[PDB]
Amino acid sequence: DIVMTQSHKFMSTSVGDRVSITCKASQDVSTAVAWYQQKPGQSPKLLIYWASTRHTGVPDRFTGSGSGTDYTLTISSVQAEDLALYYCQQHYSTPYTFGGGTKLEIKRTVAAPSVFIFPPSDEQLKSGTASVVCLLNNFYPREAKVQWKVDNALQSGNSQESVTEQDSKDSTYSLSSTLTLSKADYEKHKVYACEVTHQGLSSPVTKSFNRGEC
């Protein structure tokens, strides 16, 4: 079996800059290398076949280089929508093998989250559960501490976050943290608070409501 080593799981680059993603083969696959782009929740799209040849609907800023063992996908003038995973692959001999992938991370200017907090809907409250949602919209960079406080008492072990991938237009991340509690435990407390720590904030930002009140 032919090994296709992409040594970088992570490349970081800026809009307008040039990136080279490398891919090394364990032996001479003599030019029969393809590059694939996979954007968040999409299927791969072929970018380049036979090391240097560009497929259709493919912009001229993507080029392919390489002979024998070492291969290189170069993106001249990186664009915001170029966020994706990049995979090489040898089509030299079966079994066809792919590299381990390279995630292109795009650098952008700091941006602070807009923070929104959402109480449980009156109708989930009916079904027995209170799911409190806190939204961090459009921030950069990724690192973000979200802390829940219920009557100014710090919460632990009872929330869950998930984060989107960098947006194709503005390169920002977004996050939702959900505080899950039983309806009974929900209605013993007044103040529900979402406190957000992020580099683009002077000081932590707290979003909060008093239960049942505007």
Added chain:
Amino acid sequence: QVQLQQSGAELVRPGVSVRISCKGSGYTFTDYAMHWVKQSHAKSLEWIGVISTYSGDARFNQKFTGKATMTVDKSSSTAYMELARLTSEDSAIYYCAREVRRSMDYWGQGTSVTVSSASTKGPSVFPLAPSSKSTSGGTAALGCLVKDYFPEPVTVSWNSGALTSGVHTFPAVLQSSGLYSLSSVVTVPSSSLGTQTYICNVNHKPSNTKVDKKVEPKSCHHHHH
């Protein structure tokens, strides 16, 4: 133009087998051999095998011999792969990609296979209502909570595909119950919170649940002066 349309999300049981289809369209199907590739974990792409659509001759990744079986049916322009004796390490996303001269030039949307002994459950859907607590100047955030479903995936669209800008649909998380839960949000000019309707369309294919949920501003008790 060119599209490969795959069979949808499958929820199957250990020890049984799945049949996945891949319909070629916009081109002459018999022109191009069809590949199948496995996407597991997060990133690991694996070549399973090729079937020549013109002859029916298939040849396999030795890692998949026995386990994978390929047939092609020229009249429906559809390629088939059968995965046998399923275990939880066959849970993955499987792609068909046509070969167009030593290159896999167009891929399908992928088929999500989930190997489980559980039944499907359809999601509950609840509004994430806009208010003063969700306004940051001209823009209001609103959304939908898609709770207590299995397996993946659910799809969420806003206003039946018409509201696309400012929409974030988050990765599902796994609750203690073993059931998935995700949120879909959209930020919206607040000028339009009365005049414009906001509806989220949740589609859970494996349970055949469609829900179209109206997101109104919540009941709310106002300060008293």
